[PDB]
Design a protein around this nucleic acid. Structure first.
Lengths: 148, 144, 145, 149, 149, 149
DNA sequence: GTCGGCAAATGCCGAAAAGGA
DNA sequence: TCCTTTTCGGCATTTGCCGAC
C-alpha cells in the first residue's frame, strides 16, 4: 500500500486518477478493489483506454493478446482474473505516476523510459511480477521524497 | 502514568508508520499505538488483527512504558456515533495530532470496549526521550 | 479504586458461588470475580470460558464498581511457578480469604497476562454495602460482538 | 437449588424453554419432571425436534440409534427411560444455554463448538455421561456468574 | 462436578470413597472421569461390588440386566457407556452419602430405604434420571448442612 | 523498503524462509528476484512443495491447474510468468507470515483461517490479485508494528 | 463419506505470416 | 517501421469417472 505513503493530497489524487482510469470509486475499500479485479473488468474499457492513448497497443497486447480481446468482446465476457490483474497493475502504476508528477504526459514519458536499475527495462515492463510492481512503486516514492 | 504496547519490537521508534497505516494514522508518519493495560492491548490486537490464541506470534513482546505525569497530551475532539466504522475520520484526526507535534500523547477511545482509553505516541515529539521501557515476559502462568 | 465485572447479573450478591466453583474458590461461598479494566474482564471471560464474539451472551452486562479509599485489602501469599495448573491451591487460598472475612478485596494475578491484577470481592464483608455499581452499555462504537 | 442460582428470569426462561422443547410444565415440580422422564417421551416428539432443526442427526443418534427409533415409532412405543434421560439431558442443556446466552443461535453455537476444557470436544458430545453434563452445567453457571478468572 | 463440592472438607472424603468404589483416583480431573466412563467399566468390578455388599442384585440389575451382564462377562467386553454411566451414578451417590453420613452402613441404609420426598421411592431408584440424581444430591446436601424444616 | 520496516533481523528471517521455499538466494537483489520470476519456475519445485505439505492441493490448483502442470513437467517447460508470479506470491506471503509469527504452523493457520476484513476469505485466497496480496502484507505488517487499535 | 486425482475430447488462447497505414 | 487481420495449430483445463484418506 505504498500509494498511501504519498504526502498531503497524493493518495487522494491517486484515487481520483484511478477512478478516471478504471472506474474505481475513490472511497471504495481495498477489499472492494480486490472484488472488482476478481469479477473481471470490461474489455470495452480496455479498448477505450487504448483508443484514448492511455495505453500503447503493445501495452494492451502485453495485458491481453488481440485475438483473445476480440473473443472477449464478441462472447461478452469480462476479463479473466489475471488479465484484469495486469490491467489493474497498469492503471495503478499509471495513477501513482500521475499523482507523483502531476501530469499525464510526464508520467507516461517516465513510465516508457528505460532505467538503469531495471537493466534497461521500462517501468511498464516491470509490471509482470509483484516484485517489479513493488520496485516501480518504491522508485516513484523515492522520486516524490526528493521531488523531481 | 503507565502504558502498554504489544509489538515485535522492543523500542518506541514506530518507524512502521512510515509505510503502514492504521485506524488512527495514515502511512508516512511515525507513531506508536499503546494501551492502558496489558489485557487492553492484547484484546485490541486479538480482535482487530484476527489472531487466534493458538496462533499468537512468538515474536510478539509486551512493552511497559513509563512516563512522568508532566508529559503533554492533546485532547481529541468529541466523536459522534459511527466513528468506529469511519477510518478516514480517525486517520485524519491522528494525522493532525502527529503532524502538529503539539503534544506527546493523544488519548483515544477504544472501538471494542467502553470506558477504555488507548494512546497515540508520537516519537518525533521532543518529550519521547523521557520514556522508560522494559519488556514484560510472558510466563508459563501467563499464557493464552 | 474502580473495579470491572462482566456477568449476567447487575448486583454484587454472588449467590451463584454457593453452587458453582471457580479458579479462586470452591462451591459453597459467595464471591464476585472482577478486573481492573473492562478489556481485562472481557479477555478473561472470552479466554477461560471459550466464548466466541459471535456467541457473546445478550444477558451479559459490564459493571463499574466504585469503592472508597478506606476499603480493606488482603495479601495473597507468595505463589510458586506453575500455579495456573494447580486449581486446588488457588481455590484453597481464595476459600481461606473468603472464610476469614478479614477484608473485602483480594488482589490475585492473572493466568493470561503478565503484570495484570484481578480481584476477588467478598459480598459478606461489612464493606460490601459501600460499593457503588453502575452498568456500562455496549454501544456499536465500543463493541466486539 | 438451580432456581436459586438462576436469578432474575433465568430459571423462568429455562422452564419456558423446557416447556417448549419437551412439553414439561413450568410449574411442574422436580419430582414431576422425574416421573415424566420415567413414563417415556414420544418418538414423534424426537422426530419433530430433529426435523425442526433442534437436534442434529448425530445428536439424535446419540440419543437413540436410528433402527431402534424406527422400531419404537412403528410399534407405537414410547422411549425407554435411558433414552428419555438422554433426550432430557439434551433439552436441559439446550434450555440452560438459551437462558444464560439469551438467544437460541448463540447457545446452540457455543454448545456445538470444541472446547479445550473438554480436550477438543463439544458440550453436546459431553452429554453422554452424567459427569460431562454436569461439567457443561458448571461452565454455563460460570458464564452466568462471571467466574472467568 | 455440579453439586458435590458444597461440603467442608467433604469433597476429598467423597473422592476417596469414590476411589474405593470405582478405580477413580482422588486427583483425576473431571474430564478424565468422563473418559473413564466412556472407555467402559469392567463388569468384573460390578459383580465384585454386588458381592462385597454395596449393591443389591436389584440395584445391580437396575444398572444392567442379568442376561446382558452374563453376556458382558463371557464375551469380555466392558460395560457400555450407558451401563457404565448408571454404575457411575450409583457409585457417585454412594460415595456422596458415605461422605455425608461418615460411614458406609448408615449411608447404605439411607440409600436403600424409601423416602417420603420421593413418594415412597428409594434414592437408588431416583438414579434413573438426571433430575432424580440431582434431587438425591440436593437431599444429601441439605442433610450435610444441618438444615431443619 | 520491505527491509526498512521489516527490521533487518526479521528481514533476514524472511529472506531465509524465501530461500528455503523458492531457492532464491538470500543476498540476491530485488531485480534478481524479478528476473527469476520472469525466467520461470520449475514445476518440479511446485510438486515438491505440495508433497512436503507446504502448499495445499487446492492452493496448488490456485497457482496452476494440475493437468497444465503435468503438461509443463512432461514438456520440461518452466512455468509461465503469471504462474510463476502466483507461485511467488504464495511463497512470499508464506515467508513474511513465518517471519512475523515466528513459527510456520501459526503462520499457515493464520493464512488458512477466514478473516472478517476479507468478508470471510482466507489470506491465501486473497493472493489472486495484486491488491489482495498487498492487503495481506499490510495486515502482517500491522501485526509486526503493533497497530492493533 | 470427503478430498484428491486421471485422462479425452470440448473448448479456449493466441501464434505466425501475411496484409494495411 | 508499426500495427493489424485472421487462419486454424496448438495450448489449457474443464468435466465426469475413478481412486486415496
Amino acid at each position: 500500500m505504498l500509494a498511501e505513503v504519498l504526502r498531503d493530497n497524493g493518495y487522494h489524487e491517486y484515487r481520483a486518477r484511478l477512478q478516471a482510469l478504471l472506474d474505481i470509486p475513490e472511497l471504495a475499500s481495498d477489499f472492494e478493489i480486490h472484488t472488482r479485479i476478481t469479477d473481471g473488468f470490461a474489455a470495452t474499457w480496455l479498448v477505450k483506454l487504448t483508443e484514448r492513448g492511455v495505453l500503447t497497443p503493445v501495452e494492451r497486447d502485453q495485458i491481453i493478446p488481440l485475438r483473445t480481446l476480440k473473443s472477449r468482446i464478441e462472447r461478452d465476457q469480462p476479463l479473466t482474473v489475471d488479465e484484469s490483474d495486469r490491467l489493474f497493475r497498469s492503471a495503478h502504476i499509471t495513477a501513482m505516476a500521475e499523482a507523483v508528477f502531476g501530469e499525464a504526459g510526464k508520467a507516461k514519458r517516465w513510465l516508457s523510459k528505460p532505467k538503469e536499475r531495471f537493466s534497461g527495462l521500462t517501468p511498464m515492463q516491470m509490471l509482470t511480477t509483484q516484485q517489479g510492481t513493488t520496485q516501480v512503486e518504491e522508485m516513484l516514492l523515492q522520486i516524490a521524497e526528493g521531488y523531481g | 502514568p503507565i502504558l502498554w504496547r504489544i509489538s515485535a519490537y522492543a523500542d518506541l521508534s514506530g518507524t512502521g508508520g512510515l509505510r503502514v497505516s492504521g485506524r488512527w494514522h495514515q502511512a508516512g508518519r511515525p507513531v506508536v499505538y499503546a494501551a492502558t493495560s496489558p489485557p487492553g492491548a492484547m484484546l485490541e490486537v486479538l480482535v482487530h488483527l484476527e489472531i487466534d490464541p493458538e496462533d499468537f506470534p512468538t515474536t510478539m513482546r509486551l512493552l511497559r512504558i513509563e512516563l512522568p505525569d508532566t508529559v503533554s497530551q492533546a485532547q481529541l475532539p468529541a466523536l459522534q456515533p459511527g466513528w468506529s466504522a469511519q477510518p478516514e475520520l480517525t486517520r485524519t484526526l491522528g494525522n493532525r495530532f502527529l503532524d502538529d507535534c503539539s503534544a506527546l500523547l493523544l488519548p483515544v477511545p477504544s472501538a471494542i470496549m467502553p470506558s477504555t482509553t488507548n494512546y497515540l505516541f508520537n516519537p518525533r515529539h521532543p518529550q519521547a526521550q523521557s520514556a522508560k521501557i522494559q519488556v514484560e515476559d510472558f510466563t508459563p502462568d501467563s499464557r493464552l
